[PDB]
Write a protein that binds this ligand. Sequence first.
Ligand SMILES: *[C@@H]1O[C@H](CO)[C@@H](O[C@@H]2O[C@H](CO)[C@@H](O[C@@H]3O[C@H](CO)[C@@H](O)[C@H](O)[C@H]3NC(C)=O)[C@H](O)[C@H]2NC(C)=O)[C@H](O)[C@H]1NC(C)=O
Ligand SMILES: *[C@@H]1O[C@H](CO)[C@@H](O[C@@H]2O[C@H](CO)[C@@H](O[C@@H]3O[C@H](CO)[C@@H](O)[C@H](O)[C@@H]3O)[C@H](O)[C@H]2NC(C)=O)[C@H](O)[C@H]1NC(C)=O
Ligand SMILES: *[C@@H]1O[C@H](CO)[C@@H](O[C@@H]2O[C@H](CO)[C@@H](O[C@@H]3O[C@H](CO)[C@@H](O)[C@H](O)[C@@H]3O)[C@H](O)[C@H]2NC(C)=O)[C@H](O)[C@H]1NC(C)=O
Ligand SMILES: *[C@@H]1O[C@H](CO)[C@@H](O[C@@H]2O[C@H](CO)[C@@H](O)[C@H](O)[C@H]2NC(C)=O)[C@H](O)[C@H]1NC(C)=O
Ligand SMILES: *[C@@H]1O[C@H](CO)[C@@H](O[C@@H]2O[C@H](CO)[C@@H](O)[C@H](O)[C@H]2NC(C)=O)[C@H](O)[C@H]1NC(C)=O
Ligand SMILES: *[C@@H]1O[C@H](CO)[C@@H](O[C@@H]2O[C@H](CO)[C@@H](O)[C@H](O)[C@H]2NC(C)=O)[C@H](O)[C@H]1NC(C)=O
Ligand SMILES: *[C@@H]1O[C@H](CO)[C@@H](O[C@@H]2O[C@H](CO)[C@@H](O)[C@H](O)[C@H]2NC(C)=O)[C@H](O)[C@H]1NC(C)=O
Ligand SMILES: *[C@@H]1O[C@H](CO)[C@@H](O)[C@H](O)[C@H]1NC(C)=O
Ligand SMILES: *[C@@H]1O[C@H](CO)[C@@H](O)[C@H](O)[C@H]1NC(C)=O
Ligand SMILES: *[C@@H]1O[C@H](CO)[C@@H](O)[C@H](O)[C@H]1NC(C)=O
Ligand SMILES: *[C@@H]1O[C@H](CO)[C@@H](O)[C@H](O)[C@H]1NC(C)=O
Ligand SMILES: *[C@@H]1O[C@H](CO)[C@@H](O)[C@H](O)[C@H]1NC(C)=O
Ligand SMILES: *[C@@H]1O[C@H](CO)[C@@H](O)[C@H](O)[C@H]1NC(C)=O
Ligand SMILES: *[C@@H]1O[C@H](CO)[C@@H](O)[C@H](O)[C@H]1NC(C)=O
Ligand SMILES: [Ca+2]
Length: 942
Amino acid sequence: FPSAVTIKSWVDKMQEDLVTLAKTASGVHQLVDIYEKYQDLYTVEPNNARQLVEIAARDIEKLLSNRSKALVRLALEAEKVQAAHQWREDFASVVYYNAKDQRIKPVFIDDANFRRQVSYQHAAVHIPTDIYEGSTIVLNELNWTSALDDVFKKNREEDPSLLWQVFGSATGLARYYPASPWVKIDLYDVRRRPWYIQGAASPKDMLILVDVSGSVSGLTLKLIRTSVSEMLETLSDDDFVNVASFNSNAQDVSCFQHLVQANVRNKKVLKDAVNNITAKGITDYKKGFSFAFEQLLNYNVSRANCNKIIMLFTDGGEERAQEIFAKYNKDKKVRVFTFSVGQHNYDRGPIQWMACENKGYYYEIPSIGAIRINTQEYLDVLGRPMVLAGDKAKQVQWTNVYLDALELGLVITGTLPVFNITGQFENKTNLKNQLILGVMGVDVSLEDIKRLTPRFTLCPNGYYFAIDPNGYVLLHPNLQPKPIGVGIPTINLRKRRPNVQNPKSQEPVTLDFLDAELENDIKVEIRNKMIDGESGEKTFRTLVKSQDERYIDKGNRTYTWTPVNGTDYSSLALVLPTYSFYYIKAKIEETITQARYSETLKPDNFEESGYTFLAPRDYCSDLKPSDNNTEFLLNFNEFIDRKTTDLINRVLLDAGFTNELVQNYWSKQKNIKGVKARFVVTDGGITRVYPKEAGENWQENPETYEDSFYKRSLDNDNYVFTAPYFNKSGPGAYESGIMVSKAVEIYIQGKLLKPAVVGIKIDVNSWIENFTKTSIRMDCVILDDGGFLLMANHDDYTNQIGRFFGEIDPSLMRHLVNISVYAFNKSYDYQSVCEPGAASKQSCITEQTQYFFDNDSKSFSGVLDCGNCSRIFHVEKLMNTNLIFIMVESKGTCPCDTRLLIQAEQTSDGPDPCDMVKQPRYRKGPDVCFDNNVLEDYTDCX
Ligand SMILES: *[C@@H]1O[C@H](CO)[C@@H](O[C@@H]2O[C@H](CO)[C@@H](O[C@@H]3O[C@H](CO)[C@@H](O)[C@H](O)[C@H]3NC(C)=O)[C@H](O)[C@H]2NC(C)=O)[C@H](O)[C@H]1NC(C)=O
Ligand SMILES: *[C@@H]1O[C@H](CO)[C@@H](O[C@@H]2O[C@H](CO)[C@@H](O[C@@H]3O[C@H](CO)[C@@H](O)[C@H](O)[C@@H]3O)[C@H](O)[C@H]2NC(C)=O)[C@H](O)[C@H]1NC(C)=O
Ligand SMILES: *[C@@H]1O[C@H](CO)[C@@H](O[C@@H]2O[C@H](CO)[C@@H](O[C@@H]3O[C@H](CO)[C@@H](O)[C@H](O)[C@@H]3O)[C@H](O)[C@H]2NC(C)=O)[C@H](O)[C@H]1NC(C)=O
Ligand SMILES: *[C@@H]1O[C@H](CO)[C@@H](O[C@@H]2O[C@H](CO)[C@@H](O)[C@H](O)[C@H]2NC(C)=O)[C@H](O)[C@H]1NC(C)=O
Ligand SMILES: *[C@@H]1O[C@H](CO)[C@@H](O[C@@H]2O[C@H](CO)[C@@H](O)[C@H](O)[C@H]2NC(C)=O)[C@H](O)[C@H]1NC(C)=O
Ligand SMILES: *[C@@H]1O[C@H](CO)[C@@H](O[C@@H]2O[C@H](CO)[C@@H](O)[C@H](O)[C@H]2NC(C)=O)[C@H](O)[C@H]1NC(C)=O
Ligand SMILES: *[C@@H]1O[C@H](CO)[C@@H](O[C@@H]2O[C@H](CO)[C@@H](O)[C@H](O)[C@H]2NC(C)=O)[C@H](O)[C@H]1NC(C)=O
Ligand SMILES: *[C@@H]1O[C@H](CO)[C@@H](O)[C@H](O)[C@H]1NC(C)=O
Ligand SMILES: *[C@@H]1O[C@H](CO)[C@@H](O)[C@H](O)[C@H]1NC(C)=O
Ligand SMILES: *[C@@H]1O[C@H](CO)[C@@H](O)[C@H](O)[C@H]1NC(C)=O
Ligand SMILES: *[C@@H]1O[C@H](CO)[C@@H](O)[C@H](O)[C@H]1NC(C)=O
Ligand SMILES: *[C@@H]1O[C@H](CO)[C@@H](O)[C@H](O)[C@H]1NC(C)=O
Ligand SMILES: *[C@@H]1O[C@H](CO)[C@@H](O)[C@H](O)[C@H]1NC(C)=O
Ligand SMILES: *[C@@H]1O[C@H](CO)[C@@H](O)[C@H](O)[C@H]1NC(C)=O
Ligand SMILES: [Ca+2]
């Protein structure tokens, strides 16, 4: 039973230790004087936030205008060549490429924009392996499409760095220049690609009715459970659905009861509802359709207000529901596509009738295999209103982000339909002009937009970002490839085969603005203002998740936004802290001075300067080191010695200042008693570790803007203690020790600049030795921001260093959150890969529970009562630093091993989507839309 004055005097002894050891060993107060002394070699220039945003909006506008324009050239030529064709029937005269293996076998160049072998002299062709022998529908369309060869080749010379041009086509071919070898079974139908089903129709309020009566059971039900799952893959993220069965009565076997958004997530609820359909009852078709036309009302919701589709997966029946379409379809504004599946011997008579009265189109499905071809030809009917406005339907329609099939990265496509002009201005009988040919696509990699958005003048905390009218993400730096979505991934191994590659999931990567950052009632008000807003900034105190999900910091974010002045399929946001409005412009003028700076950077001097490491960056002719930063550093010296424009000027100025911490403050100390290894990480990407012997175990990412502790120490105005991983793979441990950090504030003529982070990596053993000799002059735990053990007595805990305290003594920690200090948050990360459960690596949703300090008052006294043992806590925060000191009495007396508070990530389901739809997230759909011309002429279907 200790006493509070004696404890607080003893905490203030450990406070004055770790602070004074930090100020002496790190050259923090010495390095400011280095930055103060050289008042020259600067002109500190502002960022201005705004002026950055309007300039970077004009380049993202011109990039989508430069490539977009090319689309018009491919659409104008493709149609021109299509008029003069004359339909050859025999083919004894053609020579294309067939990229899956007369034909061509050309030369290949290893090229680096494509990261792959390209040709530049031919287009390649992908004919899906369901189709082909020479069948003169395919073979004739290789004829006129060969003309687009000159115009594909034209646009590389007009503007380089174009990625894949592509003409998709309604018969399934793809010509794409540059020609390249296509990447056991290759499924890949181009007509079901999100970039085709997007610019091939207008958005869609679908409603799927599924006959679940007693007559569908058997084969013809199993084809409906497959075909709805193959139907819903043809929906973009502007399209809405619902799935409704009918039988005796009617019901929306989905758990939604109205129309939903057809996200990645909301389509998964439907694929578990459809796969648990039972089959029993009596068909009636009158309680069914009258439930279908009510759902396509409900204006209450927030539908898209466009092509209304009722799709029908019945088997058969003798019921023309004539009393219903006269009730609801007098104005003929609901297209009804009807499918009739399986090999039932029923009456297909009425089902053909329902679709040819209601501008529909009857389809038929014999078996599995016809499912992929039939449920995509339903978009040729929806293109019928678009072709009748061919002067003004050629807008450009950009697709929201998805992974390329050729292995390029995240790419965004621009699409434009190509329509059949073969009589026009002469007009003509005009027989089948009411169908499109295909869609021209032009890719942009998001790296090419990131080339436009420089992330190296703003503090590593600052970053650009961009939101598309459905409230999803182009440039938030928390995206990364790998698909996202859905929940706990159950795979049984008791069902698979020694066979097929388990297909590649054409799903797009749609991250929500509320699920990249932390959800807050201000950032909602930002997004709903940013999604259509004209201009606005807001400065506020938020929770900022740290880059590795250990920690939560609290800082001031001043961010602003503006729309793209051209297209409206994006709007940008430059994000800046309050201490990053001013940056350092390098300005070096003597040419001897920067020559001496280059001397320092050579690897010959690591005994004198130490282990210097130089972050991978951009210039003319270099690469990305695969951990061989030594190879990058030698290549970088070859850049200087050939030189004997601002990144090259900054790093040379940065090395010259981090030199004078070594040769003037660390060379005069020479292996201090304590510490373990001094380190300096700056922006400019020069991280130096002084001794170089155990500094080879510096296991951190040398790119400083991706670096996990550099960003944290800029926010806090004091010492930050990081706690290392436990086991981690390897020796970061006792062998490594724990770290200290403090950013470096600079006082130029009334301004605030924080360029550098200076740190110490504390020896674990020597700081044990003070900690126990101070106690002779009881169960003590040093515990940081986040519940991680830094050190402790009792020596069963020192085998744990860095493990979260909830897996040590949870009864303290479940208590300690319940009395404030420390609170938490729980966010979701949609892209974390984990292992599949029970019934190798794939994507899943993980929870992330991150603990952090709440109030002030660094004195928390209180008593814990579990039962029949009680014990007394004295929780004391150390001042001017990031630490809690806890005095807990006697593990010893009887335990309470109830459970564990567990950090790290746990595989979980998402939020409840049945409740998430109720009050959904504000959004705005496009404005065009095309439906119901007077002409049309519906006399096909059949
Ligand atoms: C915990 O262990 C540390 C060793 O890793 C000890 O740190 C050293 O303590 C010395 C005295 O406490 C300091 O000496 C002082 O150094 C300054 C500048 O170097 C001189 O101006 C002072 O004259 C000198 N003191 C005297 C009496 O001459 C060491 O600088 C210091 N090491 C560092 C890196 O700061 C801690 O003392 C030890 N904790 C306790 C409570 O003993
Ligand atoms: C599609 O393929 C056909 C052939 O499979 C191409 O037709 C060919 O077109 C060229 C020029 O239009 C013809 O050349 C002509 O030759 C005659 C003599 O034979 C000459 O008098 C003309 O001055 C002209 O040079 C060629 O004969 C013709 N081939 C056939 C079999 O008729 C057509 O060009 C292809 N389409 C595209 C867009 O490339
Ligand atoms: C663009 O639309 C036009 C319609 O104006 C399409 O032209 C027609 O295409 C069909 C293809 O089935 C041709 O039918 C074929 O005619 C030959 C006679 O030479 C016959 O032997 C075949 O059995 C078949 O019936 C039709 O002739 C043709 N119309 C004309 C005036 O030539 C054209 O196909 C569309 N473009 C594309 C790429 O689909
Ligand atoms: C959405 O639809 C519901 C129907 O479920 C509407 O609720 C009806 O509102 C009228 C108002 O004229 C009342 O007379 C009815 O009694 C309501 N129905 C029920 C079952 O109570 C609702 O008004 C619609 N609009 C909104 C915004 O919710
Ligand atoms: C596109 O951006 C331009 C400027 O880049 C905007 O022009 C502004 O026009 C308003 C009034 O219409 C003026 O008050 C501003 O001074 C103009 N801005 C500039 C830069 O001078 C234009 O408004 C933008 N387009 C739209 C549709 O808002
Ligand atoms: C990264 O690249 C450098 C090349 O400069 C490697 O350094 C050489 O490594 C080999 C094998 O370990 C040694 O035999 C040489 O003596 C090293 N120096 C030179 C100048 O060749 C370094 O080992 C590479 N790192 C990794 C992890 O592969
Ligand atoms: C994330 O943590 C913040 C910590 O501030 C939570 O915000 C506080 O929540 C409590 C209880 O909900 C309120 O009493 C406080 O007034 C809130 N403070 C502020 C500034 O809003 C927030 O609720 C947490 N969010 C989640 C999803 O856990
Ligand atoms: C726009 O296109 C022209 C045409 O080649 C090109 O020179 C220019 O660099 C493009 N703009 C940008 C920002 O790349
Ligand atoms: C139907 O299947 C779904 C998905 O597995 C499940 O949630 C639901 O409980 C099932 N219903 C019945 C009656 O088995
Ligand atoms: C935001 O700025 C104010 C004024 O400069 C400062 O006092 C405050 O500490 C900052 N907020 C945080 C969370 O640090
Ligand atoms: C990780 O550390 C825990 C200590 O709780 C230990 O039980 C486990 O075996 C370690 N794993 C590896 C791979 O070393
Ligand atoms: C923990 O917090 C909850 C929520 O405020 C409260 O109901 C409960 O009483 C607290 N626990 C104790 C032991 O007071
Ligand atoms: C923060 O929590 C502690 C818990 O004891 C309390 O003493 C302190 O007053 C709280 N601060 C505020 C501002 O409520
Ligand atoms: C605590 O006391 C109860 C009776 O009040 C007794 O039955 C129980 O065994 C005791 N448990 C411990 C752990 O002391
Ligand atoms: Ca039936």
